[PDB]
Amino acid sequence: SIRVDGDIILGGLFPVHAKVPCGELKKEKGIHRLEAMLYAIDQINKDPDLLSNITLGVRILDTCSRDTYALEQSLTFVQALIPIFTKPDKISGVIGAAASSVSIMVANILRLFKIPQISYASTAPELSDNTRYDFFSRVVPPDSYQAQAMVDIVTALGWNYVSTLASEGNYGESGVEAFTQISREIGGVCIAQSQKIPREPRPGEFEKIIKRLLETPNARAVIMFANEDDIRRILEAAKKLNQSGHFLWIGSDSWGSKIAPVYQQEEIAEGAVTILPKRASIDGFDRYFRSRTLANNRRNVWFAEFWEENFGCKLGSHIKKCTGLERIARDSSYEQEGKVQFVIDAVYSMAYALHNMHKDLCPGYIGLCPRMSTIDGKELLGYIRAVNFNGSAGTPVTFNENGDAPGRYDIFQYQITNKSTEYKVIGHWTNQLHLKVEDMQWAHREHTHPASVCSLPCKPGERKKTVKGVPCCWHCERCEGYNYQVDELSCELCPLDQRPNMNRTGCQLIPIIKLEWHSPWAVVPVFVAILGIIATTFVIVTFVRYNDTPIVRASGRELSYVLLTGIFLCYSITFLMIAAPDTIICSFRRVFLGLGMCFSYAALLTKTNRIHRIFEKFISPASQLVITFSLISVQLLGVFVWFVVDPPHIIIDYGEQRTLDPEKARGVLKCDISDLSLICSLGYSILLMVTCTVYAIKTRGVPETFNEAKPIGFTMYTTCIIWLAFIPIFFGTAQSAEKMYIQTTTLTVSMSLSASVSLGMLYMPKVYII
Amino acid sequence: SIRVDGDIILGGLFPVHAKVPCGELKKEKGIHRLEAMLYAIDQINKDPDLLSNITLGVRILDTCSRDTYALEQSLTFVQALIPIFTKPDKISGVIGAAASSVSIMVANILRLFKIPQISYASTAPELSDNTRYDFFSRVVPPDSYQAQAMVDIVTALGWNYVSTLASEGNYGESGVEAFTQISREIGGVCIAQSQKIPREPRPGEFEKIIKRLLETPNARAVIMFANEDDIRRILEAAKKLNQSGHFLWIGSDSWGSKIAPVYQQEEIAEGAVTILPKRASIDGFDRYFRSRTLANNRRNVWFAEFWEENFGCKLGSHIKKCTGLERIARDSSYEQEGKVQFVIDAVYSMAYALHNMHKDLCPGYIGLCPRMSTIDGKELLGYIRAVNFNGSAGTPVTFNENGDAPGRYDIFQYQITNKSTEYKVIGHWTNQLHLKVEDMQWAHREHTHPASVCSLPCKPGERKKTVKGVPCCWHCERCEGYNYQVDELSCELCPLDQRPNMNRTGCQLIPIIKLEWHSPWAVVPVFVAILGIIATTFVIVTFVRYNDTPIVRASGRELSYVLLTGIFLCYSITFLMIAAPDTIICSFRRVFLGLGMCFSYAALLTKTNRIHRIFEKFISPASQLVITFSLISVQLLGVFVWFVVDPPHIIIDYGEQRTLDPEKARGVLKCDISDLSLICSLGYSILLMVTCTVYAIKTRGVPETFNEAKPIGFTMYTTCIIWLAFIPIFFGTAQSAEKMYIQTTTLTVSMSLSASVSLGMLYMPKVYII
Numbered sequence A, B: 001s002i003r004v005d006g007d008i009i010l011g012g013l014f015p016v017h018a019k020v021p022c023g024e025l026k027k028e029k030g031i032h033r034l035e036a037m038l039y040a041i042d043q044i045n046k047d048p049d050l051l052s053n054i055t056l057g058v059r060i061l062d063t064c065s066r067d068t069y070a071l072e073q074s075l076t077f078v079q080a081l082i083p084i085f086t087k088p089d090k091i092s093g094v095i096g097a098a099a100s101s102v103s104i105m106v107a108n109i110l111r112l113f114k115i116p117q118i119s120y121a122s123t124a125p126e127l128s129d130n131t132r133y134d135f136f137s138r139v140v141p142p143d144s145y146q147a148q149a150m151v152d153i154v155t156a157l158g159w160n161y162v163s164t165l166a167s168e169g170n171y172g173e174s175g176v177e178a179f180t181q182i183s184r185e186i187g188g189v190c191i192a193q194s195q196k197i198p199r200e201p202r203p204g205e206f207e208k209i210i211k212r213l214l215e216t217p218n219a220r221a222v223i224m225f226a227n228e229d230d231i232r233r234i235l236e237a238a239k240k241l242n243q244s245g246h247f248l249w250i251g252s253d254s255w256g257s258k259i260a261p262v263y264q265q266e267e268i269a270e271g272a273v274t275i276l277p278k279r280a281s282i283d284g285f286d287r288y289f290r291s292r293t294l295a296n297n298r299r300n301v302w303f304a305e306f307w308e309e310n311f312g313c314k315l316g317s318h319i320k321k322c323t324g325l326e327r328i329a330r331d332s333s334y335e336q337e338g339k340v341q342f343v344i345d346a347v348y349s350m351a352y353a354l355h356n357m358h359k360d361l362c363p364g365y366i367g368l369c370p371r372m373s374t375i376d377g378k379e380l381l382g383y384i385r386a387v388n389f390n391g392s393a394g395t396p397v398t399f400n401e402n403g404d405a406p407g408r409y410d411i412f413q414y415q416i417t418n419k420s421t422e423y424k425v426i427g428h429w430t431n432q433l434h435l436k437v438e439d440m441q442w443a444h445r446e447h448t449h450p451a452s453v454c455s456l457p458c459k460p461g462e463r464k465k466t467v468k469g470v471p472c473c474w475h476c477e478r479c480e481g482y483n484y485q486v487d488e489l490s491c492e493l494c495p496l497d498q499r500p501n502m503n504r505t506g507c508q509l510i511p512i513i514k515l516e517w518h519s520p521w522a523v524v525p526v527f528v529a530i531l532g533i534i535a536t537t538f539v540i541v542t543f544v545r546y547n548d549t550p551i552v553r554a555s556g557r558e559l560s561y562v563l564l565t566g567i568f569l570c571y572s573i574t575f576l577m578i579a580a581p582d583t584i585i586c587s588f589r590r591v592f593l594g595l596g597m598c599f600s601y602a603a604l605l606t607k608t609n610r611i612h613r614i615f616e617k618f619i620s621p622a623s624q625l626v627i628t629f630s631l632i633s634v635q636l637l638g639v640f641v642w643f644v645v646d647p648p649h650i651i652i653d654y655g656e657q658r659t660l661d662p663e664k665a666r667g668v669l670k671c672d673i674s675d676l677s678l679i680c681s682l683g684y685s686i687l688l689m690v691t692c693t694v695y696a697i698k699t700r701g702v703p704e705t706f707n708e709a710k711p712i713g714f715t716m717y718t719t720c721i722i723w724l725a726f727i728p729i730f731f732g733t734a735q736s737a738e739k740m741y742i743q744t745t746t747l748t749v750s751m752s753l754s755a756s757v758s759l760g761m762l763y764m765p766k767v768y769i770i
């Protein structure tokens, strides 16, 4: 209870003593902060251009790290609303703070009474909502803003799969929850595990915690939000359990820049990312400390306790009279707190709020106005969250709509080297991230920056199926096969005319194979074909020169001409059916087939007709010319109408071959000549064969006549069986893979065999010598 | 501020005066309740076996329907924690209530200090959660328990589609929200509309509200939760807008049992469901009122104001000395409040809590114990919610875990009749619903109970598709067609052999139609068939008797026998192919077909063979017997192997007919005799025909011989064309719907025509007279 005059009175709650009130002068926490508050008030009342003639007053009470004691004191604040009675004060703002769950309770009791309250040290995420704390402002970063630093650094280093660790308190739980929530929304990071310790661990607990963190050897980032016991005991109990070089630690101030947690556990904590609230050094207030005497500070009720506990003398034991002694040399090691700047900033913000309210409510009139006499709570709260000023550090102090303060942290890193063991500054976090990546050193099992990704980007051509529920993880599967590889998750089929590339991705044309001119199957047919076209040509040459000569007289008639033409055409098609297929070749092959088949058989039938039926015009010229021209014209028109013969149209078997291995699958350059087309084409040939067979069965009972007409029948009979053998060897070739090879060989050889039989008893031995 | 002695002191907040404090003695609200509290305390201190020698004290303060004034008074409660100074009191419980937002604020300031608070009149749903009101108990039903009555009655009457109405306040909004929430979870009810009025309506607002409630003429239940202005103005502004007999009203106490809202708007509110908190009548406290003098009630600070405002005399104007006058006769119309029972119940509950705590904390020792000297807040709160007692009504008072009280309401109904205009009691709601349905009267446009269902259950066979998002609504679609009707939403196809029932649901066998024996298409073939079997039989009779007779000598040989047999068989199959199909009939038809076709044609060929080729064994017996027996045995084995002839197997065309109308669709009893089977069956007949044609073309150049052999050829030629005509009229019948009819007629008539041609020049005119 400190009474300082004033015209606008404020209040102050401070943690003098410790956890009704136990006796331990908390010193740094309490006394320092009281002196800071009174100091800042003292320079507020001197600045001529801050609040004009208005003066400030102060009502400083005590809290002993208890919630209820602070409740009684906050009741003491509000007592002007309830014979030498003195006028009570009128508090227009409360400026006090401590560990949380104290600011919470005073915030409730003060929001019930529309009194603003600005805190300097209370940093609890639960105190970050307008509901239930509409009147609570804060001039220090929330601890939830610390969880935005770990997320940013984890994203910056590329880690997406981490393991969180915490302690059972209101600190660890809230910090881990904020880390999880920021990890959500903005994605890119995943949490493998979340292990929370108890307040008191049973024997072996740390071993189980370590081994369950060691269960998944892919998450090697441990974001610890937990007090010193976890640090010390996890880093020491991992020595003989051998997780060294397997976990990288990122911790909050609970670890901080301290060296006490690990006295020698340095090889288990060879790397760390530590976040600390920024710090300053107030010069005028240190002077205030240095100028405080005993005859001056009668303003402090509990200041003799400071004299007794800061030097060890019980004035009321060294029993020293204590004379007069400045508190630097005769005092023990001296240092101030880091939170004095915030308790100065709070009172400055409140004074600025009052000044800004004066600017509007009471214009021009120096001092006060009756309108301004009552300091309305709502207007003051509105003006408090409207200040953008800077003081006592050179750094700005401002509040968002919630009333919190922007967070300014710094980041330290821990490594070792010969003679070097320190906490280098790798950067900071003031509404953004600033990391000196090249400054970081992880020189224990990781030469470059370490890795914690759940899965690793694969080679192209291996479809990566993201496992459901965890984008940070996936599993790669080969997409080899006829299907092409399009995207990371997309690989669909490429067209059958595109063999999939041997590069495990891409597609290319299938090679096309064709019956080759030089092959171990076509050489013997072309050879026998040319052998035939030599001997047959020789005989034809013999006949024509000697048409009138006896014995060859029957040969002189054009019947022999037509038979020879048919034989030569058969041989020609035998040769041509071998060479490489082309756009129009096969149509020519078909026309030649029709032509030769008509010629030879028509000659055979007309000769048989002339020979036999005449036993009951007969002359060779008349009969032959008519029938030959007629039948040739018939087949000529049959060819002309392009029903059996195909157009230049062809087929390429790019993908018709169904080989499981694309590589060895091939194709053929096949004219689209159907087997039914072949059968119907030779149908007229079959009819001629049937007619000639009937005629020669009639001849079988041959009249005496001559002897040259029986070989005609015999040769035709042999050719009948020779050609009938073809049909089974036409149908049976479809089963084999080399359908084209066997089909072409059998057709060509069967034609050559029929031709050679016609070259037999028909006209060879009759002219052995002519 | 009232001071009453005591050893355990309680507190009381009451609404004396009205909305710093304006001067209007609120009377019924304040004074009555103060007297009730002091009365209940007076009988608490007399009961020998309630709290033993412990005595109670009282601290009664005032609230003037303001939140802040109550805040100051609640500060006054807690002042024992902060030279003739007197010892302040120690309140161990607060017993006070008012309209809400006052109990809320005192509950906050008291939960900060672990002081129990039991309310008697504060009924706000927001005060129904352990969070922020852990120390607030209630001895009156929440208004949220009223929203459980409307839901129950709406479910009981069958309504599932209603329209909610509200007023812009903390009453209407919360009530409608609770109604919606209870409408969810347990389903069965839907809300068509939710219209909320403003605090001040612009001109025409009510017209727009009425017309938007009138937009959907299917929801005719209006659950109003709104104060009197809505009642009066909506019921009066609907007169000329003609929504009478279109909305049924269910309202809360804001309407209540009052008659002031509608002075004459009775035909727009001819029916109502009103919910009211239950009521009692305290007898001892009315006596307390009657026994209060002026020289006694010095215990009340504000009691002269009651004397002045309850009679009109300013003692300090009738300026009457006021003598001594009891407050019944010389006083104006006297009546008490309904909430006195609750303020008695609160103090009784607190005293019982203290007694129960004494039972455990201090055993056996009468008076007090040092352990029991401090009345811990947590233990007292635990014991408060452990009481199951009854008093001051005969009804029980108890608290759930939340601290609320069970709700006991009654339900009134408003109707009119000649000379009757009242609020009958249709039942109540005490943790359940009790409705006298037969007591309700809606005798204005609804003789029976009215209806508000969004959709109406349809007839079976009409699939009801529930509209998504609203189970209470659906749309019925006919499911006529071959698909059967299974369930309300399920109607799938029934088997093709089951015509869907004409009952719009069900399936039944399709009638099967067959070629009938008496038909306008089969009569002429069967008639010509029997005509043939008469004349042919007559000729056969003639031949056999006269085999040796000349002219008939050629007929004597069994060649004529075989021809006659063939003709008779043809006629027989002509007859049989008409009658109804059966299991095995068609196989017999096929065998007879083969037999007759073989017989007739074989005879024709063998006769032709005997006649012609012999110009270059010849005797009738030898030749005929061999060939006839051989060919008949051939066809006999052909039949025996059941390849062409089908087994007893048959087909029924239950659903093969594809008629869009199932009703007229039919089926046929068809043997599975394929057309290819017919063609291949007659193939041997075709071969015989071809052979005979060749033979008779050879005969055409007939030798002189005789003249009976040329009709053989001529008749065969005619039969050739007659039978060849059948094939086009065999193939062309498939297009027509009556495929069976035309096919059977053409086959049978073609057979009869061929038979009649064989009955022509073969053997008829050669025996004109024998």
Ligand SMILES: N[C@](CC1c2ccccc2Oc2ccccc21)(C(=O)O)[C@H]1C[C@@H]1C(=O)O
Pocket (backbone or CB within 6 Å): A098, A099, A100, A121, A122, A123, A124, A170, A171, A227, A253, A254, A339
């Ligand atoms: N920021 C503090 C302390 C903060 C903390 C906050 C909430 C709960 C636990 C908790 O424990 C730790 C442990 C290590 C580092 C910081 C904290 C606050 O209580 O708000 C504030 C008391 C500190 C001060 O007054 O100097």
Ligand SMILES: N[C@](CC1c2ccccc2Oc2ccccc21)(C(=O)O)[C@H]1C[C@@H]1C(=O)O
Pocket (backbone or CB within 6 Å): B098, B099, B100, B121, B122, B123, B124, B143, B170, B171, B253, B254, B339
């Ligand atoms: N039940 C009351 C009143 C209830 C209500 C509750 C909440 C908000 C508004 C509100 O206004 C209406 C209007 C008409 C009927 C009942 C209420 C409570 O305040 O809880 C309480 C005042 C009653 C009393 O003190 O006798």
